[PDB]
């Protein structure tokens, strides 16, 4: 189990670690998070008590280095940093654990929620969507735009999601206009899966990362990308059976985790009604359709 120590907590802040969250008081003796499960990516996220503007946070994998958080009073945020000195890092963590100045990642043994949300998400793929190659961890916030949003403005601070545009020459073969617009199988299987993603795992990894950035940061462009990747599958007549069965699991756990009170801002009525009730795959998402009908029947 790995540890993200904190230098201090000089400003009152709600701290997120994956799907969990904790309130820390101004100058409270808080020195970080221990017992973080090895084997998954994680996200540590922040919302300041005195300015709920900019949710922000860091995607990381404790297998890739020793990371800690330090408040920067100039830039006014909690920053993730890497410690290259292993013995210094172990000595700081040991001191904080002995003084019980750390919260424990509160995982229930029965509880596969975080695995179910991050099954296909890998740090190397996050670092290609979020470009800052000098760090092994990835900063995301509420306001960051996507490459596609910027096309329709600082490119270094952008989310490089794969551009999906149903009315683009990439999506429509000359001579197959009606076929390709009404059945997106070409666009899904040849252009996206065989061409850009190489396999369904990379496609699902990006879809899962988009959802988590939408949910944890209220990142609007991430929400658009999540819905576009759902709609591209549901709008395709020809999808491998394993991909449909896996999409149903992926979406079920996303819909299960979503805060009930955020459904109005995180769920697109048009996309979900189309995917569940009109699309080629309207009958392929049994688990997702049942949880959506029982939890958010007003959206539908």
């Amino acid at each position: 189990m790995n540890t993200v120590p904190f230098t201090s907590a000089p400003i009152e802040v709600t701290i997120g670690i994956d799907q969990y969250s904790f309130n820390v008081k101004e100058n409270q003796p808080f020195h970080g998070i221990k017992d973080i499960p090895i084997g998954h990516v994680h996200v540590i996220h922040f919302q300041h008590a005195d300015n709920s503007s900019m949710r922000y946070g860091y995607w990381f994998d404790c297998r890739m280095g020793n990371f800690y958080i330090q408040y920067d009073p100039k830039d006014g945020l909690y920053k993730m940093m890497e410690e290259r000195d292993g013995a210094k890092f172990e000595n700081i963590v040991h001191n904080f654990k002995e003084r019980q100045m750390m919260v424990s990642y509160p995982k229930i043994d029965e509880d596969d929620t975080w695995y179910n949300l991050t099954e296909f998400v890998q740090m190397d793929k996050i670092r290609k969507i979020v470009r800052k190659d000098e760090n092994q961890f990835s900063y995301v916030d509420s306001s960051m735009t996507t490459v596609q949003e910027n096309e329709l403005s600082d490119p270094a601070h952008s989310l490089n999601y794969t551009v999906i545009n149903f009315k683009s020459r990439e999506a429509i073969r000359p001579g197959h206009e009606m076929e390709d617009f009404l059945d997106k199988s070409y666009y899904l299987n040849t252009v996206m899966l065989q061409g850009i993603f190489k396999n369904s795992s990379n496609y699902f990894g990006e879809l899962q990362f988009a959802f988590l950035n939408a949910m944890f940061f209220g990142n609007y462009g991430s929400s658009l990308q999540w819905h576009a990747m759902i709609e591209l599958i549901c709008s395709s007549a020809t999808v491998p059976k394993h991909m449909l069965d896996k999409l149903d699991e992926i979406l079920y756990y996303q819909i299960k985790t979503l805060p009930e009170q955020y459904s109005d801002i995180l769920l697109n009525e048009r996309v979900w009604n189309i995917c569940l009730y009109s699309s080629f795959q309207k009958n392929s998402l049994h688990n997702t359709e049942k949880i959506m009908e029982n939890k958010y029947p007003e959206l539908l």
Partner: protein, 237 residues
């Protein structure tokens, strides 16, 4: 965006534009079968593609063979319309290509946008105008060429005859929409108004009768009376 009464003069400026009306592309008669079920029989249709400034009409005749063994014909008809308008634009020299295509029905927007991806600078727009272009098949010479077609054909007309020698394109369009609205509302009464007097004929190379300026005023008044008379009958008003 959408074309309405706020931007009506835009139709007669010097930016090439076309109206596309798909109403008459897929046309059927509905009839009983021997077993007492119902069946459709397609008849020849047409795309109505009009330059409202010049009167140039690109009438693409849709022959019934294009529907043979096809499904969801009302959906296909929109895509076939977009395919043929796209083909017409590509057939025109660059300086004759439209800068805007206005579709009379909003269901034509996505099919035309997708067929015109290669032309990102041609704007595809809906209109809030209710234009009577469905009544095109009430113009005897347009009906005759559509019904006689034995294969796909494009026929070029000037829907204003020689009117632009005497009137502006705004006035020519107003006269056309009034004639087509009257033909749509009461075809028999409109044709009686147009053809009753046998001393006024239609030139071989025209669509409408050779009315003098004063006779056009009389005809236009009789068309307005027809439309009001019919509105009084519909609503008992």
């Amino acid at each position: 965006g959408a074309m309405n009464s706020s931007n009506y003069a835009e139709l007669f400026n010097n930016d090439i534009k076309l109206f596309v009306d798909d109403t008459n592309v897929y046309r059927v008669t509905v009839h009983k079968t021997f077993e007492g079920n119902v069946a459709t029989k397609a008849i020849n249709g047409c795309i109505f593609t009009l330059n409202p400034k010049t009167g140039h009409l690109f009438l693409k005749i849709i022959h019934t063979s294009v529907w043979a063994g096809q499904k969801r014909l009302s959906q296909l008809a929109k895509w076939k319309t977009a395919e043929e308008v796209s083909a017409l634009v590509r057939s025109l020299p660059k300086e004759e290509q439209p800068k805007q295509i206005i579709v009379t029905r909003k269901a034509m927007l996505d099919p035309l946008e997708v067929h015109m991806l290669d032309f990102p600078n041609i704007a595809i727009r809906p209109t809030e105008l209710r234009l009577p272009f469905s009544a095109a098949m009430s113009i005897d010479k347009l009906s005759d060429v559509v019904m006689k077609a034995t294969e796909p054909q494009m026929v070029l007309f000037n829907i204003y005859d020689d009117w632009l020698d005497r009137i502006s394109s705004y006035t020519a369009f107003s006269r056309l929409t009034l004639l087509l609205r009257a033909l749509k509302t009461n075809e028999e009464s409109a044709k009686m108004i147009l053809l009753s007097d046998p001393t006024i004929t239609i030139k071989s190379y025209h669509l409408w009768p050779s009315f003098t300026d004063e006779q056009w005023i009389t005809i236009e008044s009789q068309m307005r009376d027809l439309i009001l008379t019919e509105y009084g009958r519909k609503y008992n008003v």
